[PDB]
Amino acid sequence: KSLSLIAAHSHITGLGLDENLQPRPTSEGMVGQLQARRAAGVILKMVQNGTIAGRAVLVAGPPSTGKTALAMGVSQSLGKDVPFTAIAGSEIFSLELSKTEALTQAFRKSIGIKIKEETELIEGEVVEIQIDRSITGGHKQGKLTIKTTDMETIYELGNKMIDGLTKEKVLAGDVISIDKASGKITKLGRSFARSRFVQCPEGELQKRKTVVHTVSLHEIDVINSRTQGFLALFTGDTGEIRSEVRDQINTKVAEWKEEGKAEIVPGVLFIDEVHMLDIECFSFINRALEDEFAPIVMMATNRGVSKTRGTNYKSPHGLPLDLLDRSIIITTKSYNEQEIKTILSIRAQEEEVELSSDALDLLTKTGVETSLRYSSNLISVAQQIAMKRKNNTVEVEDVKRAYLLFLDSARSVKYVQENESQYIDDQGNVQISIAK
Amino acid sequence: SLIAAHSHITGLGLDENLQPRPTSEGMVGQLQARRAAGVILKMVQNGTIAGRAVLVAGPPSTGKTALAMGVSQSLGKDVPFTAIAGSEIFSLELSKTEALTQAFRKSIGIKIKEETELIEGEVVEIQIDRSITGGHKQGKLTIKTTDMETIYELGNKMIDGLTKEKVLAGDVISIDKASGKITKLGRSFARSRDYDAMGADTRFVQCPEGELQKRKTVVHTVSLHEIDVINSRTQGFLALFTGDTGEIRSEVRDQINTKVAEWKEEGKAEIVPGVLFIDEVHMLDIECFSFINRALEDEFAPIVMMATNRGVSKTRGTNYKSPHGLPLDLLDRSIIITTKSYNEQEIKTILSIRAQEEEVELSSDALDLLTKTGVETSLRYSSNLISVAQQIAMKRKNNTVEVEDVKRAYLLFLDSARSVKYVQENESQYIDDQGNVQISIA
Amino acid sequence: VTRTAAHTHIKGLGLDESGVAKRVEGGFVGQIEAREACGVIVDLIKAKKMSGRAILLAGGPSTGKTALALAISQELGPKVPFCPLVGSELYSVEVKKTETLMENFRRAIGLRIKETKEVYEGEVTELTPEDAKTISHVIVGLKSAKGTKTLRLDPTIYESIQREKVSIGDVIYIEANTGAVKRVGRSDAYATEFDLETEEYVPLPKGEVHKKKEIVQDVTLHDLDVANARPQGGQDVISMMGQLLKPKKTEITEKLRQEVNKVVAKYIDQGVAELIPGVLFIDEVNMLDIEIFTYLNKALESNIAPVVVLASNRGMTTVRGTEDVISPHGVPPDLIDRLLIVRTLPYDKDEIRTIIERRATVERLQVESSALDLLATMGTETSLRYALQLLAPCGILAQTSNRKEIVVNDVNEAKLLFLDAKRSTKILETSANYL
Amino acid sequence: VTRTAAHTHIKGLGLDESGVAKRVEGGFVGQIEAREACGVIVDLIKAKKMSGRAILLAGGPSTGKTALALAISQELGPKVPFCPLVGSELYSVEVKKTETLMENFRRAIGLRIKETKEVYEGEVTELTPEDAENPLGGYGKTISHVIVGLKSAKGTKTLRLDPTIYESIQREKVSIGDVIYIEANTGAVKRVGRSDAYATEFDLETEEYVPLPKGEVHKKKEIVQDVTLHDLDVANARPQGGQDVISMMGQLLKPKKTEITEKLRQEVNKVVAKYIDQGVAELIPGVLFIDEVNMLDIEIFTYLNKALESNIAPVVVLASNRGMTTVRGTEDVISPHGVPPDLIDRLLIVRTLPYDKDEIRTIIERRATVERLQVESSALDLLATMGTETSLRYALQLLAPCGILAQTSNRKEIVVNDVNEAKLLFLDAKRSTKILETSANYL
Amino acid sequence: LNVEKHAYEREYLNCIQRGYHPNVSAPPVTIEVLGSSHVTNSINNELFDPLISQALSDIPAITQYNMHVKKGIPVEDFPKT
Ligand SMILES: Nc1ncnc2c1ncn2[C@@H]1O[C@H](COP(=O)(O)OP(=O)(O)O)[C@@H](O)[C@H]1O
């Protein structure tokens, strides 16, 4: 389940918080940033309460300060069965959808409906199957013996059950699941009988089982529109769904909640790099947040006073002031030496790399000096240099060798700036020849 | 047929030591460029190296396209020569890189060896069995020569080729098995009881004698791009003619490369690379140049010839100026053939050759005045004047162009310098760049 | 249970019978003149006599323009069509922007049809076709828990019955007017014919076989336009898998529109349909190109144009698509002649305090008096929206300390945790690299 | 004999067992530290544990960056998927650039599955259909069942088919006397050809004649297949392979790139993880190579910043020859190598160095010995001085005209005079620019 | 007006070999509704529409003989193939 090699945020299992929403210094893979974690815990409580809608928050700070780490912590603390959509700023610039339509689809993907239904099921291990044919074979008679670990029974079959058993061959000793009302029979496997391999089911054979469904508003939006089927949820060409089906879906969902047949589960939409949206997207986002079925929007940006896209002026955070008026802003700060070394030790534990104390100190020094991501990339590349000399622990010499082999930002700018005759400039001039 | 601009050039005019003759094969002058083009021609004919870019540069009306046509005519048959312009890359349904990939793959030919069987003889009896609707078709054919007579079995396509191009008993047909083609050669029986339904006057041919079934080995050249278009989808053979081949995936190209290498490894097919010619290559985006720089490094890459008549000008897609309008990365991996302007004797020989091709009997002094007006003005103007002078000359009903008809044609039709001289003193009559004009004459 | 999103304390304009507005009534505080002008416009809409009337309401940000348009929508009632819109939505990659404007115009004119639902439901007891081969009629006997009832049927409904594979003993649903046939399932009394079968068993309906109900259908002109202009063809009732070709939005010809108008007028003349004109509301009108602004001039001169309401917060701003045209509110001077402008005023301290108290009441929160004074001072110092957004984290921080009433300390912690735009810009200015 | 184009003298990085590069090994000359860093990257890729690791190959023109990427691909072997790409490929007219980038990301991850196939095969002996009692009833088809009798070497089976398999059998145009191949996973039918048990000289359809298949009729065989994740996504988004009318009509439509949703990717990942948990499939992560990375827009870089943080991402290798250059799509952002500072933090830069005169001389030596040419020593010294004076590449591709001019004089030796003639006939960028400046009308 | 067939038989296109086949082939995504036979009926009707699946292939010849001669059904009443 959920195959993954190692992620860059794989150590974050949530927000480290107490029962009084106080952040521990080291919990759940998150260290430091006490005020930002407290604010994100308040936002998490806002989402889990579910009584308010359409509030936008902004996580702003310098680069490499843990904004995406905060978003991943909120997403892991939400758990399953709550919608979480994560998009980038450049994702909505489509050739087949308008920008407002893509933003609308991303908005309605983040709110879901919890529907609870029950179905009656058959589960057991097949003992013996008899199919009988007549002289002409016009009618078919049958008997099926099926057992669990507690009972055993024999059923008399009709024509459509016999046809459904002949199709998708079922032999003796197979564990199968039968849905009577739909006629779908699945082979769970084979029982443990030497004389795939699953165990024989226990308890009753006729079980009424309850399955809790959660379906987003965008799925019912696609299915209710007749212009395409449910295969557009996978192929991805929905093609500018009309508004009137969305008002029908809104009214139907409202009366479903009134009757008690459904519950509304709002979620979080996360927009990473929100400064790359046009001003039309910002103006749509301003008026899309006052709807009753609107999620809580999280935006993350790292710019200063920069040019807003599609305009000719400059704005704080790259966003216009009317969008910033409806936002509450969480500010992240830079890290210390101890926080950097704790981050590097946690990244060592997740990458299964054993480090010396001196190697950790050198990594902390070069991480304070250059970048946190540079040391977090150097630590995994030092282990291969250590393993080429056939030893397990990563020492100082491996870190110095990796620091010599792989450059960083400021050093690369420094070697470029006194060798610029060999590189292609903004004017397209270069010197390739060695002499003259 | 009809007369084109470079209709007098069929070849390059080179000796066995790759040294050009002064006037041979429709080409006169330009010895260094002709020698370099002959070297590139032998480089193509060896077929041992791939992905080499050649740039031809010089002033306008010098013979760059003449050199490209000479290379194409000296290339010979069954060697692909794709000639495109720089403006055809930009398309509404294809990306620029995809169009450049297709133009690259058009210039690589695959020569496939096939083994066929030929059957010729008189038809004795045709039996055709069909369904009630008409879908399922089968039948037997009894063909016969002088010595042998066998009975064959027929399929759907063979019955379709038999029904259209109507065959009766007594007709002589020729069948090719691997191509599925039926040709009727004539009739021999001369049946008496003819139902008068058609006006057939079929030829009387003789009885074919000897072996009924003969084997032969045939060779045909297909392009690589045709194989991708055929293998791309279900009805790609229609897309070969309608041009509806939208962005063929990379997996198709990988599998086609693997199967082409497998066919080469057995002896069924061999690879014949060709020449891709890009005229006005400066009319290209910088993304096209960045794609060309890395598409020249592949195994299946033709030799690319480019022509430019541009100096240090702006490179498209950028805001700086570069030599020949090309970035320095593309100019790094190119060898450059330069072309120089002409003399008076070369211009006289060009005009005499173009008069010989267009069948115009020019006088001596008419040729001297055409050379004079072709050395003051450009060469193409004096080349264009010859047909007009001829058409003026047939109005007086004499089949010899004098200097009077040439003077009349020079009076009637203008040059560029006379046009800018007339425009620049009457700027109120013509529409200004600011859109102002004077229409009233008072 | 109950959700709240930036509104829903706004219930109406809060006017008396004379058209005058009270101070605090209907969720609105302040702004008497704009509310009275909007009530006059609501009366004009209810008159149902004029077409192509354009109103612009202008003012600063967070002054109450969208609340006024929402109050218009609540005062008109659910019967009148109301089509809210943002100006950025008129740009699409499928059709031109003028066609999208035409569709949004025609979405604001509605119709009311009075129809009758007639339903036969029960267990099939008799199914006897007969030849007149072509069957002339079939006799179906239906059974419920309150008796049985037999029906003659046309052969088309028998064809639809043969589509659904209906046998004796199935519970079916027949609609008399449309002719739709739905198979609910086999009846519960026939459930022990086999021990195991692929058929679902449903009980008998406990009501009568015959059911009669009067309903009202509300459609718009745009629904008829898109129903009459399917390019691929008429879709069936149920298509779970998609159409083989993707149907794309097209440029609907005005000949189709005039045919739809002719048919609708013919049905109106017979007393079947009722015409309900409505309101088209375009928020952020300054985001329109000048070509849409030119097309609005001809679109306002049609005979079936609705009442159009536009909003803007810009000042003397260049019109989009132009470079040397400066016009008030971002609206070009050719179009600004055709509207009537309603001005909207900023608020005072006491109005801000009353708005904050109302928002705390609707969100089911208790606040202290000193917390209310601090929140009012913060609202006057930063913005009105900041205190409204900061009200709910104050409630959460009061909840985590096991209390039910917000005090000054929770407001101080919420002010510490979350910033406004001014303090964020102050941090942005005095920073080294990118905040 | 063979065909050579600008490469294929490079057979790998040419390192030792400890990671130390030799001076001349694998066709490489010099660039020792770059080759050692690339060997460390090769070991990291072969470890099969890391996701979203990005390196950047930064240097001047003609310093060997594409050669190093080719050596990476040759050292990893053909089992690991390698996806070469230029920066201009991502601008497609059918779909957005973000989807093309994610498609190449999923195309760079491989898979190896051992698949069991249920197979019926044999020579068709009897083909007899049975009819329906009311074929014009509107619902239900014309026939009910088709009896097919197949025989093999030591075996004969009679099968009763539903109509749906028979429609594929009829579409394959089978008859009595043909060897067929029915696979039961998707219902696909392959018609092999006529059986050899009858006469083979009385046809006109150029068909080949196969004998009977060995073994029984009903088999279960194991097949090892190598697929990528993009193949699974493409097969699920445009479904062909079933016997339903959606699948048969999916083959006849013109193919077009669509925006594959994230839901399909998560479901494909879940199915692949369930396959791996059963011991059936194994995961082979690979390398995506993007050349001329400065041709990308700011939006593609901003999407790369998020695409590298996924948990299934491959190892990405970039290359650029740019100094302080404005990023495309921006007007004021000046950044090293044309790559924005948000991406440089997630990168490890490998720097390539220019060459020396002796390195130019020996590189010309290997390029001459690969093209099957022999040169003199003085001509080699002239070529090395020429490569230092103008460019390495201009000295590299002057070899073939020299060889042609040597061949046309009936010699198998490249001498100084042939190199002088190649200078006289072909120019370089500097001499062409010098002609262009001192020109009348852009000569 | 017959350029395409002449280009077909000029280059021997009925004896060439196939070079590409897809890597993965899949049926459409199954939709499951627990406890409803109507969904199964509608899905089976959409996937295996008898008009459309009958239109994409033929009828056996002896079956056509049983229609036309032994049952008196005319050719114009055939489901078209
Ligand atoms: N407080 C923290 N606790 C644990 N890991 C952190 C913290 N802050 C940053 N990191 C790690 O640092 C790396 C880079 O930080 P990131 O969140 O990408 O920066 P940005 O906020 O600019 O996106 C990530 O892998 C993240 O896991």
Ligand SMILES: Nc1ncnc2c1ncn2[C@@H]1O[C@H](COP(=O)(O)OP(=O)(O)O)[C@@H](O)[C@H]1O
């Ligand atoms: N050496 C030559 N031999 C024959 N014709 C020539 C020669 N040089 C020029 N021409 C004629 O002069 C014209 C040159 O134009 P063209 O080659 O198309 O453009 P450019 O010379 O700018 O490359 C051609 O029409 C060609 O017929």
Ligand SMILES: Nc1ncnc2c1ncn2[C@@H]1O[C@H](COP(=O)(O)OP(=O)(O)O)[C@@H](O)[C@H]1O
């Ligand atoms: N007079 C008022 N009484 C109560 N609430 C108001 C009033 N005016 C504005 N508001 C509130 O202010 C918030 C923002 O106002 P809004 O309608 O967005 O103004 P604008 O559209 O001009 O920005 C809304 O949630 C609304 O409830």
Ligand SMILES: Nc1ncnc2c1ncn2[C@@H]1O[C@H](COP(=O)(O)OP(=O)(O)O)[C@@H](O)[C@H]1O
């Ligand atoms: N170390 C080397 N050994 C041998 N040949 C090399 C070496 N480095 C570069 N070359 C050759 O020089 C040329 C450089 O091309 P390429 O690497 O594509 O350009 P760049 O260096 O700009 O990436 C290639 O033809 C390559 O064969």
